[PDB]
Design a protein around this nucleic acid. Sequence first.
DNA 1: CATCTG
DNA 2: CAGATG
Length: 327
Amino acid sequence: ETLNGGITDMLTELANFEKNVSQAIHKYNAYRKAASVIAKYPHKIKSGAEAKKLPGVGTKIAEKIDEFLATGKLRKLEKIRQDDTSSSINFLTRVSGIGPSAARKFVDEGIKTLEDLRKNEDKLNHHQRIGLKYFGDFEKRIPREEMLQMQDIVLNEVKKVDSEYIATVCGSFRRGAESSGDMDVLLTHPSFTSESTKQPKLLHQVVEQLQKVHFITDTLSKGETKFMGVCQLPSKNDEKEYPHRRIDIRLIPKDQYYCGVLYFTGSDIFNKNMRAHALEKGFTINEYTIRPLGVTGVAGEPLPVDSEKDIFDYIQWKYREPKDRSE
DNA sequence: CATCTG
DNA sequence: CAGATG
Ligand code: NA
Ligand code: NA
Ligand SMILES: [Zn+2]
Ligand SMILES: [Zn+2]
């Protein structure tokens, strides 16, 4: 956690670049298990060979550790931080809609910067476009003070459209958090469930309403269950307009809402621990359900949940306020 | 994983 | 449809 930090960090840089710049997934994948194991390792790595000793650690990685250990740096790492081509792919990727794949193409094309991007607004697709238009805004964190306003509006409008709508803003925003990055709404409706064959409208009506009143600004991707958008808090009395904010809404069958709710609220760490315990207790839990673990190895069947309460209870746990859902 | 693109 | 993004 700090004894083998830089090692695990360099390893991380290495893995990353393998993937993003070159295409070396195996390689990339290599740096990763390595950094994981070294990460878990209880002693101070004092040398290459010492490490090598570990699983995942081989020759080439050891090689590197040595150098890194021997001196405060790593040539390759140093060469990678200069190389503009590398650098670009890191940058270009910054744009919502621009993954690595794409980052490579543009670069081979010459588009390396934001301007490059503007001038070439043709080569970009819709998402990529919005991405570009809201670059700065996109990167701005969302202070909860705005989160509440948002949340305010969202829930009021969802309500108007149908009283049976159950919406919930998960995320860290849900776990206390002073600021978030994006806004994720979990949505279900009584008339939506596991068997119940579809009902697209269920998600479309609200989307509409949102944009009706202007909270939703653009559409990123909009399917039958997931909608990816842009939204914004109505600029008050002109002088201070809001930034554009990422937002996602998703329809879930009412019969697997809280698992998800729980699920989405996190943290990952809370999840695990709960997941592990769930297992002791003789159960299993995932994004959508909780199930009684048979003995034959495994086994299924959905347990019937009506709140995050029903879940814990099951695992015979202490109900945890979302704030203390941390770890 | 669900959506888009081409 | 395979492949990309989030
Ligand atoms: Na991107
Ligand atoms: Na293939
Ligand atoms: Zn030791
Ligand atoms: Zn989100």
